[PDB]
Amino acid sequence: LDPEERYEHQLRQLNDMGFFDFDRNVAALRRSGGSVQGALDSLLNG
DSSP, rough: OOOOHHHHHHHHHHHHTTOOHHHHHHHHHHHHTTTHHHHHHHOOOO
C-alpha cells in the first residue's frame, strides 16, 4: 500500500491538528511505527 492508504487515519488526525506537510507527516509516522502520539512528538521537536 502507498502511505496514503497505510496511514489514512493517522494522516487525518495530524491534519486535524494543523500538521499539513505530507512528506513530514509520513516521515514522522514511519519513525513512530504508525503511532500518532510519536509522530506528533517528532513534528513538534526539531
